Symmetry: C3
Subunit: 303 residues, 3 copies
């Protein structure tokens, strides 16, 4: 019933900067201030202070493992708290590597949850199949019981227990998948609706279906990791990796009002806002601005 | 069968200027000239000359009541004429306050009409619940039998007879509603399709449904008040109050070709074009240009 | 199974320049290079060298007949070859006048094909009803058994045998049709889905239906002439004739992945890219870039 707002600023998951400024960007935008005005009660944990291991030299083809891993663990036990104390966590990131912390954190208390992952990418590459060492595209890989020990144990991710299986995760908005990831998602059986599916049925059904899949068997807590990169860049241009032809501002909101409407959202992530990849303020004012109504939409705001 | 084109230039409904230049903007664009070339016969009444009461000091929390009211009455009896003489009125406004004149005018002759209101706002705030004194957001409030004497009689709106009930009005494109208005529309039972509905079913059904609602019982004259502000600002940026994520240029047209296709459009309003709120000509050339094909689309132009 | 890539650079079909640079634009973009990486085998015929007849003085109201006609014939017998040798032709144009060559060429070998024409225009004006002499808008007129000798024989188009009837052609994305063309398409019975149809049912059904029309009776080779002008100009702005409110980048792709998916695409045209009508590189980088994924989408690339 009450929202705790965590700030998990972090760039280490990928090679560009400013991503750790994403949380301050949205707070300056008046997020918490505009959140207070819902039927919900808002507490503000502030931004975590990430422990940076000196020379945590890249492991195999994966950069910054010890700095990211330590960095998630802190997040994990901060989220497992808020949850325990009966509140809904909202993590303002940060790379999408923060999902490993956010979900392990959410899953310790609520271990029956499902994860509806609105991103343009699967973000599911094992430290093996990774092309770009960047862990920010391996989150799901790390949190899937079905892929355990399918990529040599990354150093500092040992605290990590394979949270979730392929049957409790759905992807919406996919349009830029790496072969290997397709090999995984397709061969692992992971349900999903990429841009084409959305095109053939429109979010109306897309949503009607992710629910008849996930909440079908039983109603359970919902964890939603919104990667701001899966909206169309015309909307959220200030991201690190923008692919064209995504969801629209109208579509993003329709996702949030529906998940809101179920009454089971116990966890949300507003990952990827990079206030320094936006040529011009307007572009930035546009990303931040649309990032925020998705948050608010998940908490009551209708049209 | 013949269209009379009235010009009802007016800003008094809201606090910004240039709105009264909207009609000249569309005529300069070649509206009447491009209208002549349809199967229809075009007469051009020219622009009305609005009587401005000296010091019609704001009534309670509502500015310019005596100047707006007088200003509508003239419109009313001009529209009730054209109608009487068997023609279809097209009012180029002007604030959306001109709907009070336009409909009372249309409803005296055709009292069975329905009103399909394509706007981003309900524009239904009683002189009571109004935040912004601006009457341009109280039109519907004034023309609804179901709300009579639910807001103290505004001075100069006495000539106004509660034209229409909650059952003969539909809203399409809503996305920026004030609480009070929601209280009214939701508690009054007013059918409508806000952006989310459009998202869940797409204009195809939206339209299929407003017709199965309104023209269901009997076929009756249709009055359509298109508020240019309910298209997406990417299209009609030169407006006074633009909310994001509205209908699209394709959607606007689909509304007009369908209403056209029914063969019952006896009245239309192209309200809100403000040629001075458009940073740059292009923005203005864009609003005017898209305002005009909506007019033409309602009169025969297909694709 | 193998794709031959022909380059048919040509401007003569219309009065603007740079259109003949369209093929080099897409090759520079890495088309052939990005095509090699599909399950398909890519040969590269290079760009044809078009014979330019000295003073082939305009015939009646139609400019450049002898230069365009000669120019197609060469294309025709180049395409009828590739086909014969069991390969799929891809013509990088060039005006849309190159369809006359491309189809006569495709139809000599595969005479049972159908043509799904994704353009914003019908491009079906007889040398009679033509307003703009420009042949680039008369292609279909020339290749239709049902219109034979319905426009005096243009000089140099005698080699042309009325390939295809009104029952083996469908149009998708229409939104800018000339009266005469409407007279033809509507009176000839030519099936089609203009923007409104797409609006009422969405490409999902549009496609589901062109297939239940064309491939209904029997499965047959598919020739697809994608006119880059029928996407929305926000996407492919660098064209000669852009009308607003077309298909979207998501929609274009949905066409290509479906046609791909049938397994009968034996011929494709990526017509109209003009690298000199794009104010700014970005606009050009945008047209070329989206032109290319449509090509690739037709050859395996999914999302
Ligand atoms: Mn992503
Ligand atoms: Mn409005
Ligand atoms: Mn075209």
């Amino acid at each position: 019933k009450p929202i705790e707002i965590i700030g998990a600023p972090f760039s280490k998951g990928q090679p560009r900067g400013g991503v750790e400024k994403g949380p301050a960007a949205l707070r300056k935008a008046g997020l918490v201030e505009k959140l207070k005005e819902t039927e919900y009660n808002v507490r503000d944990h502030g931004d975590l202070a990430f422990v940076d291991v000196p020379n945590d030299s890249p492991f195999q083809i994966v950069k910054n493992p010890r700095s990211v891993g330590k960095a998630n663990e802190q997040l994990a036990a901060v989220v497992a708290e808020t949850q325990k104390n009966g509140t809904i966590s909202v993590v303002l990131g940060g790379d999408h590597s923060m999902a490993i912390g956010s979900i392990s954190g959410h899953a310790r208390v609520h271990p029956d949850l499902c994860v509806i992952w609105v991103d343009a990418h699967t973000d599911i590459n094992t430290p093996l199949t990774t092309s770009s060492g960047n862990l920010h595209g391996q989150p799901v890989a790390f949190l899937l019981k079905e892929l355990k020990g399918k990529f040599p144990d990354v150093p500092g991710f040992s605290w990590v227990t394979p949270c979730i299986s392929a049957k409790d995760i759905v992807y919406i908005g996919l349009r830029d998948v790496d072969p290997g990831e397709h090999y995984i998602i397709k061969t692992l059986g992971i349900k999903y609706f990429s841009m084409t599916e959305v095109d053939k049925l429109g979010i109306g059904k897309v949503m009607e279906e992710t629910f008849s899949y996930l909440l079908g068997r039983k109603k359970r807590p919902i964890h939603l990791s919104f990667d701001v990169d899966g909206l169309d860049p015309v909307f959220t241009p200030a991201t690190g990796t923008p692919v064209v032809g995504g969801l629209s501002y109208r579509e993003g909101l329709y996702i949030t009002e529906e998940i809101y409407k179920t009454g089971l959202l116990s966890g949300l992530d507003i990952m990827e806002v990079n206030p320094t990849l936006g040529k011009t303020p307007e572009e930035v004012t546009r990303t931040v601005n649309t990032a925020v109504p998705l948050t608010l939409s998940c908490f009551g705001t209708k049209r």
